[PDB]
C-alpha cells in the first residue's frame, strides 16, 4: 500500500520510480486548489474540493500558462527551462518524492521554482526530486503557482484581481503540505522551503508575510531575495501595468470590473503575447507582473519590515553565483553572443548600463559607469563585458541579497552564506558566461550523480556535499556535521560576515561578499537617485 | 561544587587542570579496594571500606610494585614507561577525567594499561586522559591492578594465592565505576574498556569471563588479545612457577600454606629480583606471572570458549602495529642495537628464532626458519632483521589477534579492525625499529595536539581522527560518522575480512591481514608441535 495514501482531500496512488540503482515512490500532479479558470482567473485560490475515488498521481501535471523562450531554438541550454508538459490555466498541482521504505516522520523540503515570476515549471529535468529524496532520505515536494498576469495582475482594491495570487497559490500548497504531509511520512513540523531566483524571492516573501510564517520551519534562498529590484512593484505601478495590459488588448478601462471582464475573456496566449509591453522602460532583468506591496500580504514596506524585525525569526541558508548577469546580457544587451567571446565596445557598454539600471537618471548612470569603468583601460572589451556582468549581477541579485542577509542576521537565529563559483565541465553555454544564474540548481538536486549526464567525479562529490549541506540544514538548522573533522561552514555574523565558496577545491572562508560594490548599490546610488 | 563529588564509598575532591587552552576536572588516586598488603598479599581484592571526610584526589597515586626497566638509563624512550610515582603494594587506585562543565550522563572509557602483566602504571605521561576527555567530552577512567607475583602468583586450589587477582583488581575497579560513575556525569550503561598489549589481553579476558561481562558495554583491544601465547599459563605451570619462586628465595615448599607464608614475609623487591628466574626457557616476549586458566575466572579453555561463543557478544574495535617485534628483539635478541641499523647475521638469526619460539622442538624451529628465510638471499642482514621482527610480531601479537577476531566475529555484533603503520616524526628510537609496540598509544590519547611535543600538523590530524574513531565507537558501537562524506571504516566480516590502515595518508582498505603467516602460526605450527 506504499503507493496508496489517504489524504484529507481524497485518495492518491503514486508510482515506483528507479533512482541510482534503487527505487522510490513518486506522487505526481496532486491538486491543491480549484483550477483557477474562467471567472476564477486572477482571483485568490480556493482549496481543492475533496474528490471521490483514487487520484492517479503517476505522471507530472500540466504547466502554468507562460511566455516560452524561443530565442535559441533547438538548443538545450535554453529549452531545458521551457515547459515540458502541456500548458494550462488548470495547473495548481504539487509533486512529492518519498523514500522507500516510507519513513515514519522525516524532514520535508518544498521547492519553489524561479523564472522571474513570469515563467517556471515544477516538472523540469533539473528539478527532479528523486535524487534528493533518495540520497538524503527526505520527503521532497515541488509546488506550482500562477505566473505572469495569471498570477500577479494587481488592481489593488479589487477583490477579483487583488494581486499576489501566485504567492497565495504557493501558500495554499504550503497549507496543503502542512495538513497532509504526515500521511506521506513527512514531518509537518520540519518543513524547509527553498527556491532559486524568483523562487528565492518568494521564500523571502513567506518569511516576511505573517500569513505564511507558521507554514514552514526554515528557509533556503538561492540567487534571489524579497527586496530584489525586479521582485515587487508599488500598488500604483501594478495598477498602471494592469491598465496598460488592457490598453494593449482594446479593453474597457473605465473601471476594474469592466477591465477584468475583458481580460478574463481573452485567450491565455493573447495576454502572453503583449505581456512585455507593459514595462515602463527598455530594460533587462525586469518582469511585467510581480508581487505588489499591498499592505495585506506585506503589511508595510519591505525595508521597514526588515528594519523592525517584522519577519519570521529562524535559520536561513542562502547565496549567489559568480556570474549572475551573463544570462540577461546575452538575451537583452547589444554586443553579446552565444557564438563568440562577446568583447563589448565602449558604445555597447554605455547602452548596456542604461538597460541594466533603467530607472536611473543620467547622473545615476554616470555614477554606475564610473564605479565599473577601468579608466586606465577603458576600451578593453573583455573588461567591459565582465563589468556589465558585475553591474547586472550586483544590482539585481548579489547586493539585494547581501542587504537582506545583513538585515535578517540582526534578528534571526542563524545565517549560512555561500558563493557558488564552479563552472560545470559539461556546460553547454560559452565560456565567457562563466557560472550562470540558475546553474547551481543541478548540483542542489543531484544531477551529477547520474553517469549518463557526463559530469566528473569531482562534480559528483560537490553535488553530494551540497545536497548534504542543504538537507542537514533542513533537518537541524545547521548545514554542518555535528561532530566531524571536515571543515565547517561558519555562521554568518553581523560582525565578521563570513561566507564560503562552493566549488571543487578545498573550502575557503571569506568575509564581506562584494562589500565595496554593495555599498554603492545599497547606500549611495539610492541616495543619489532620491536627491536628484 | 564541580570538584566535590559524593560517592557510595565517601566524598572525594578533585582539581581543575588546564588542557589545550581550557580546563577540566581531574579526580586522581581514588581508592577502590583495601590495600592488598601484609596478609592480603596474593589474596583476592576486598572493596574499599567507606571513609569519613573528604578524599583528596588532586594528585596521582602510588604505582604498583614492579620490575623497572633500567636497560637504557637516561633515555626517554624507555624511561617514559617506568613508574613515575613511588612504588607501593598500596596501589589499587583509579583516576577520572571529567569535562567542564560536568555533563549529565555521557560516554565512559576505562583504560587498562599494558606491560606484559609484570609492569605498568596508570600515571604515565602517555596515558594522560585529559586530552581525550576534553577533546571528545567523555568521562575517562584509568584503573590499576597488581602485576608480577603480586597480581598473578597462582597456587590453584589455595584460597590465599588463587591466581588471577590482578584481573580481579581490574574487575573491582570496573565494579566501582559501575556503582559510582554516575556521580561524575558518567553513564554506567555506556562503558567501553580499552587497553594495549597486556591491557588488550585483559580486555579480551573480561569479554570471556562471565563475572566481568555485565560491567561494561563495548571493548577496544590494541596489540593484544586474550589467546596471546604469553598472556596465560596452565594451572600446572602457574603452580610450577610459584614453587620455583619460593625455591629461589629459600622458602618452605612443603605446602601452599608454608610457601605463601614465606613469600608474604619477603620485601617486594626480593620477589622482583628473582621474578625472571621462574621462566621455563631462555626467551623473549614471555613473562613470569600471568593469568591462569583456572576453571573459575575462565570456565573452560580459551579456545573452547571462543569456539562455542561463550563470551560477551557486543561490538569490538581492535588492531595491531606494523613492527610489533622490534622492541623485544632490541632488549633480548643478539645482534640488535639502539645505536646501529642492526643487520642480523645468519647465526644471530638462528639464535633469535629459538628465543622467539622457545617452546618449539627442532622441527618446529626448522619450520619457522623456512617460513621466514629468503633462500635466494639468506645472508641479507636487513632481511634477517626484518624477518625476526615479523616472527616476534606475528607469533606474539598479530596472529593471535587475527585468530581472536575471526572467532569473535562469528558471534559478535560488529568488528572494526585496524593496522597502525605511522612512524612518528619525533620518535626517539632508531629507524630500523619502525612502528613500535605501544607507539599508537600517544595518538589514541591525543599527545600530538600538544604543540611543545613537536609533532607535525598531519600527526595532530591523525590523532584527532583516531580519538574520534575511538570515542565515537565507545558511544555508538561504530567508529564512523553516522552520515559523513569522509571514507568509512568498513565492518570486518567473516567473508571479506576487511581492515584499514591508520596513518597520515588517505584511508586504504585491505583484506586478510597477514593471512599467509597466520595460517602458519594458528593452524600448521600448532599441529606440527602436537604431532612431534
Ligand atoms: C495512471 O496513469 C498512468 C499513466 O497515464 C497517462 O496519464 C493519464 C492521465 C491518461 O491520460 C493516460 O491516457 C496516460 O497514458 C497509466 O498508465 C495507468 O494505467 C493509470 N492508472 C489508472 C488506475 O488509471
Ligand atoms: C590536597 O593535596 C594537594 C597536593 O598534595 C600533595 O599530596 C598530599 C597527599 C600530601 O602529601 C601533600 O603534602 C602534597 O603536597 C594539596 O596542595 C592540597 O592542599 C590538599 N588539600 C587538602 C584539603 O588537604
Ligand atoms: C537560536 O535560538 C536559541 C534559543 O533561544 C539560542 O539558544 C541560540 O543561541 C540561537 N542561535 C543563534 C545563532 O541566534
Ligand atoms: C555522454 O558521453 C557519451 C560518450 O562517451 C555520449 O554517448 C552521451 O550521449 C553523453 N551524454 C550527454 C551528452 O548527455
Ligand atoms: C547487532 O544486533 C542488532 C540487534 O539484534 C542487529 O539488528 C544488528 O544487525 C547486529 N549487527 C551486527 C553487525 O551483527
Ligand atoms: C621542541 O622543539 C623546540 C625547538 O624548536 C625545543 O625547544 C623543545 O624542547 C622541543 N620539545 C621536545 C624536544 O620535547
Ligand atoms: Mg464575457
Ligand atoms: Mg563575471
Ligand atoms: Mg549526506
Ligand atoms: Mg564524529
Ligand atoms: Mg611471618
Ligand atoms: Mg617490521
Ligand atoms: Mg571528534
Ligand atoms: Mg552528515
Ligand atoms: Zn466582453
Ligand atoms: Zn617465617
Distance from CA of A100 to the nearest CA of B (A): 18
Q: What is the distance, to the nearest Å, from the Cα of residue B425 to the centroid of all Cα atoms in its chain?
A: 24
Q: From B324, B325, B385, select the one nearest B349 (Cα to Cα).
A: B385
Task: Calculate how far, in angstroms, residue B253's C-alpha sits from the geometric centre of ligand 16.
Answer: 12
Give the ligand at the shortest distance from the Cα of B138. Answer: 13
For residue A481, what is the nearest residue in chain B, using CA coordinates?
B484
Could you tell me the CA-to-CA distances from B328 to B334, B341, B396, B414 in Å, in that order? 11, 15, 11, 32
Q: Are B191 and B106 in contact (CB under 8 A)?
A: no
CB contacts of A464 in chain B (<8 Å) are: 485
**CA-CA distance, A151 to A198, in Å (whole number)?**
13
Residue B360's φ and ψ, nearest 5 degrees, are -85, 150
**CA-CA distance, B260 to A432, in Å (whole number)?**
91
A337 belongs to the catalytic site: no
- Does ligand 4 have an atom closer than 6 angstroms to the CB of A511? no
**CA-CA distance, B497 to B28, in Å (whole number)?**
41
**CA-CA distance, A264 to A388, in Å (whole number)?**
40
Cell numbers that stand for B13 in this block: 575532591
**CA-CA distance, A474 to A471, in Å (whole number)?**
5
Could you tell me the CA-to-CA distances from A348 to A50, A326, A329, A365, A379 in Å, in that order? 57, 15, 11, 14, 11
Task: Calculate how far, in angstroms, residue A262's C-alpha sits from the geometric centre of ligand 15.
Answer: 5
Atom of ligand 5 nearest to the CA of B415: 13
Q: Which segments within B72-174 are labelled E, that is strand?
A: 93-98, 106-112, 139-142
Q: From A272, A47, A279, A285, select the one nearest A151 (Cα to Cα).
A: A272
DSSP state letter for A395: I
CB neighbourhood size of A274 (10 A): 17
Q: From A95, B472, B474, select the one nearest B488 (Cα to Cα).
A: B472
**CA-CA distance, A234 to A268, in Å (whole number)?**
25
- Does ligand 4 have an atom closer than 6 angstroms to the CB of A454? yes
Task: Calculate how far, in angstroms, residue A192's C-alpha sits from the geometric centre of ligand 14.
Answer: 17
Question: A245 by DSSP, 3-state: which?
Answer: helix
For residue A472, what is the nearest residue in chain B, using CA coordinates?
B483
Q: From B483, B429, B531, select the one nearest B72 (Cα to Cα).
A: B429
What resolution (Å)?
A: 1.9
Task: Calculate how far, in angstroms, residue A415's C-alpha sits from the geometric centre of ligand 11.
Answer: 77
Q: Are B472 and B481 in contact (CB under 8 A)?
A: yes
Contacts of B81 (CB under 8 A, 6+ apart): B69, B115, B119, B124, B438
CB contacts of A99 in chain B (<8 Å) are: none
DSSP state letter for B336: -
For residue A463, what is the nearest residue in chain B, using CA coordinates?
B485
Q: Are A173 and A212 in contact (CB under 8 A)?
A: no
DSSP alpha helices (H): ranges in B181-230?
Answer: 198-208, 210-213
For residue A486, what is the nearest residue in chain B, using CA coordinates?
B486
CB contacts of B464 in chain A (<8 Å) are: 485
- Does ligand 5 have an atom closer than 6 angstroms to the CB of B490? no
Q: Which segments within B311-401 are labelled E, that is strand?
A: 315-321
CB spacing of A486 vs B483 below 8 angstroms: no
Picking from A446, A458, A482, A485 by the largest number of B CB atoms within 10 A of its own CB, the best residue to mutate is A485
Instruction: Give the closest of B464, B483, B485 to A465, CB-based.
Output: B485
Q: Are B286 and B356 in contact (CB under 8 A)?
A: no
Cis peptide before B101 (omega within 30 of 0): yes
Q: From A122, A132, A115, select the one nearest A199 (Cα to Cα).
A: A115
For chain A, the distance separating the N- and C-terminal CA atoms, rounded to the nearest angstrom, is 67
Q: Which residue among A413, A476, A477, A491 is best mutated to probe the pocket of ligand 3, counting the most ligand atoms within 8 A of its Cβ?
A: A413
CB contacts of B483 in chain A (<8 Å) are: 468, 472, 481
Which class for B461: exposed (0-12), middle (13-18), buried (19 or more C-beta within 10 A)? middle
Q: Are A149 and A168 in contact (CB under 8 A)?
A: no
Distance from CA of B154 to the nearest CA of A (A): 47
Measured by CA distance, the residue closest to atom 2 of ligand 6 is B454
For helices A381-393 and A362-372, the axis angle rounded to 10 degrees is 120
Q: Provide the β-strand partners of residue A221.
A: A195, A318
**CA-CA distance, B193 to B202, in Å (whole number)?**
10
For chain B, the distance separating the N- and C-terminal CA atoms, rounded to the nearest angstrom, is 67
Q: From A357, A516, A326, select the one nearest A421 (Cα to Cα).
A: A326
Cell numbers that stand for A309 in this block: 524585525
**CA-CA distance, A109 to A129, in Å (whole number)?**
10
Atom of ligand 2 nearest to the CA of B56: 1
Contacts of A192 (CB under 8 A, 6+ apart): A107, A108, A109, A110, A216, A217, A218, A219, A220, A473, A474
- The percent of chain A in helix, strand and coil, each rounded to the nearest 5, is 40, 20, 45
B422 belongs to the catalytic site: no
In chain A, the largest separation of any two C-alpha atoms, in whole Å, equals 73
Measured by CA distance, the residue closest to atom 5 of ligand 1 is A59
Contacts of A386 (CB under 8 A, 6+ apart): none
* Residue A303, CA atoms < 13 Å, CB-side half-sphere: 5
CB spacing of A465 vs B486 below 8 angstroms: no
CB neighbourhood size of A446 (10 A): 24
Query: Can you tell me which residue has the cell 561490538?
Result: B315
- Does ligand 1 have an atom closer than 6 angstroms to the CB of A56? yes
Q: From A115, A169, A148, select the one nearest A242 (Cα to Cα).
A: A148
Residue A12's φ and ψ, nearest 5 degrees, are -140, 140
Could you tell me the CA-to-CA distances from B33 to A498, B164, B188, B210 in Å, in that order? 55, 16, 19, 21
* Residue A348, CA atoms < 13 Å, CB-side half-sphere: 22
Measured by CA distance, the residue closest to atom 3 of ligand 1 is A58
CB contacts of A484 in chain B (<8 Å) are: 481, 484, 486
Measured by CA distance, the residue closest to atom 6 of ligand 1 is A59
Q: From B484, B465, B489, B475, select the one nearest A472 (Cα to Cα).
A: B484
Distance from CA of A314 to the nearest CA of B (A): 24
**CA-CA distance, B294 to A460, in Å (whole number)?**
59
Which class for B470: exposed (0-12), middle (13-18), buried (19 or more C-beta within 10 A)? buried
**CA-CA distance, B346 to B342, in Å (whole number)?**
13
Distance from CA of B486 to the nearest CA of A (A): 8
Cell numbers that stand for A208 in this block: 516576511
Question: A184 by DSSP, 3-state: which?
Answer: helix
Which residues have C-beta under 5 Å from ligand 16, the single-atom ion? B 265
**CA-CA distance, B473 to B477, in Å (whole number)?**
5
Angle among Cα A195, A201, A207 to the nearest 5 degrees reads 90
Q: Are A189 and A320 in contact (CB under 8 A)?
A: no
For residue B467, what is the nearest residue in chain A, using CA coordinates?
A485
Measured by CA distance, the residue closest to atom 6 of ligand 4 is A452
**CA-CA distance, B309 to B208, in Å (whole number)?**
9
**CA-CA distance, B367 to B372, in Å (whole number)?**
9
Cell numbers that stand for A183 in this block: 500521511
Question: A412 by DSSP, 3-state: which?
Answer: coil
Could you tell me the CA-to-CA distances from A146 to A44, B231, B243, B381, B468 in Å, in that order? 11, 77, 96, 83, 51
Q: Are B328 and B418 in contact (CB under 8 A)?
A: no
Q: From B349, B357, B297, B346, select the one nearest B525 (Cα to Cα).
A: B357
Angle among Cα A316, A490, B456 to the nearest 5 degrees reads 160
Cis peptide before A101 (omega within 30 of 0): yes
Question: A81 by DSSP, 3-state: which?
Answer: coil
CB contacts of A461 in chain B (<8 Å) are: 485
Question: B131 by DSSP, 3-state: which?
Answer: helix
- Does ligand 4 have an atom closer than 6 angstroms to the CB of A425? no
B440 belongs to the catalytic site: no
Q: What would the DSSP string read from start to end of A310-334?
A: -S--SEEEEEEETBTTHHHHHHHST
Measured by CA distance, the residue closest to atom 8 of ligand 5 is B413
B479-483 long-range contacts (CB < 8 A, ≥24 apart) are B479/B317, B479/B416, B481/A481, B481/A483, B481/A484, B483/A468, B483/A472, B483/A481
Query: Based on C-alpha coordinates, what's the Rg of chain B?
Result: 22
Residue B290's φ and ψ, nearest 5 degrees, are -135, 170
Question: B221 by DSSP, 3-state: which?
Answer: strand
Angle among Cα A307, A308, A314 to the nearest 5 degrees reads 90
Task: Calculate how far, in angstroms, residue B137's C-alpha sits from the geometric centre of ligand 14.
Answer: 20
Amino acid at each position: 500500500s506504499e503507493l496508496l495514501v489517504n489524504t484529507k482531500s481524497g485518495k492518491v496512488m503514486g508510482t515506483r520510480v528507479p533512482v541510482l540503482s534503487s527505487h522510490i515512490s513518486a506522487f505526481l500532479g496532486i491538486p491543491f486548489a480549484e483550477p483557477p479558470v474562467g471567472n476564477m482567473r486572477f482571483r485568490r485560490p480556493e482549496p481543492k474540493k475533496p474528490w471521490s475515488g483514487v487520484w492517479n498521481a503517476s505522471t507530472y501535471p500540466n504547466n502554468c500558462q507562460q511566455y516560452v523562450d524561443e530565442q535559441f531554438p533547438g538548443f538545450s541550454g535554453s529549452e531545458m527551462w521551457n515547459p515540458n508538459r502541456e500548458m494550462s490555466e488548470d495547473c495548481l498541482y504539487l509533486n512529492i518524492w518519498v523514500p522507500s521504505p516510507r519513513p515514519k516522520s522525516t524532514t520535508v523540503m518544498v521547492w519553489i521554482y524561479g523564472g522571474g515570476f513570469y515563467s517556471g515549471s515544477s516538472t523540469l529535468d533539473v528539478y527532479n526530486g528523486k535524487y534528493l529524496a533518495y540520497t538524503e532520505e527526505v520527503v521532497l515536494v515541488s509546488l506550482s503557482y500562477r505566473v505572469g498576469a495569471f498570477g500577479f495582475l494587481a488592481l489593488h482594491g479589487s477583490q477579483e484581481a487583488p494581486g499576489n495570487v501566485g504567492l497565495l497559490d504557493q501558500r495554499m500548497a504550503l497549507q496543503w503540505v502542512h495538513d497532509n504531509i504526515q500521511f506521506f511520512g513527512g514531518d509537518p513540523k520540519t518543513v524547509t522551503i527553498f527556491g532559486e531566483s524568483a523562487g528565492g524571492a518568494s521564500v523571502g516573501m513567506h518569511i516576511l508575510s505573517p500569513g505564511s510564517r507558521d507554514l514552514f520551519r526554515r528557509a533556503i534562498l538561492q540567487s534571489g531575495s524579497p527586496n530584489c529590484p525586479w521582485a515587487s512593484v508599488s500598488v500604483a505601478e501594478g495598477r498602471r501595468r494592469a491598465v496598460e495590459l488592457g490598453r494593449n488588448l482594446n479593453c474597457n478601462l473605465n473601471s476594474d470590473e469592466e477591465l477584468i471582464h475583458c481580460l478574463r475573456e481573452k485567450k491565455p496566449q493573447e495576454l502572453i503575447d503583449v505581456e512585455w509591453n507593459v514595462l515602463p522602460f527598455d530594460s533587462i532583468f525586469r518582469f511585467s507582473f510581480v508581487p505588489v506591496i499591498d499592505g495585506e500580504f506585506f503589511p508595510t514596506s519591505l525595508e521597514s519590515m526588515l528594519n523592525s524585525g517584522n519577519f519570521k525569526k529562524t535559520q536561513i541558508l542562502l547565496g549567489v553565483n559568480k556570474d549572475e548577469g551573463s544570462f540577461f546580457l546575452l538575451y537583452g544587451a547589444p554586443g553579446f553572443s552565444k557564438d563568440s567571446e562577446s568583447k563589448i565596445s565602449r558604445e555597447d557598454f554605455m547602452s548596456g548600463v542604461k538597460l541594466s539600471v533603467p530607472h536611473a537618471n543620467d547622473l545615476g548612470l554616470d555614477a554606475v559607469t564610473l564605479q565599473y569603468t577601468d579608466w586606465m583601460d577603458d576600451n578593453n572589451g573583455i573588461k567591459n563585458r565582465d563589468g556589465l556582468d558585475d553591474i547586472v549581477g550586483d544590482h539585481n541579485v548579489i547586493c539585494p541579497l547581501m542587504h537582506f542577509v545583513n538585515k535578517y542576521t540582526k534578528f534571526g537565529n542563524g545565517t549560512y552564506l555561500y558563493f557558488f563559483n564552479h563552472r560545470a565541465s559539461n556546460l553547454v553555454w560559452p565560456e565567457w558566461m562563466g557560472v550562470i544564474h540558475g546553474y547551481e540548481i543541478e548540483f542542489v538536486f543531484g544531477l551529477p550523480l547520474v553517469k549518463e549526464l557526463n559530469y566528473t567525479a569531482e562534480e559528483e562529490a560537490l553535488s553530494r556535499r551540497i545536497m548534504h549541506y542543504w538537507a542537514t540544514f533542513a533537518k537541524t538548522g545547521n548545514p554542518n556535521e555535528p561532530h566531524s573533522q571536515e571543515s565547517k561552514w561558519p555562521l554568518f555574523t553581523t560582525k565578521e560576515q563570513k561566507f564560503i565558496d562552493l566549488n571543487t577545491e578545498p573550502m575557503k572562508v571569506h568575509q564581506r561578499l562584494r562589500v565595496q560594490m554593495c555599498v554603492f548599490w545599497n547606500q549611495f546610488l539610492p541616495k543619489l537617485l532620491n536627491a536628484t
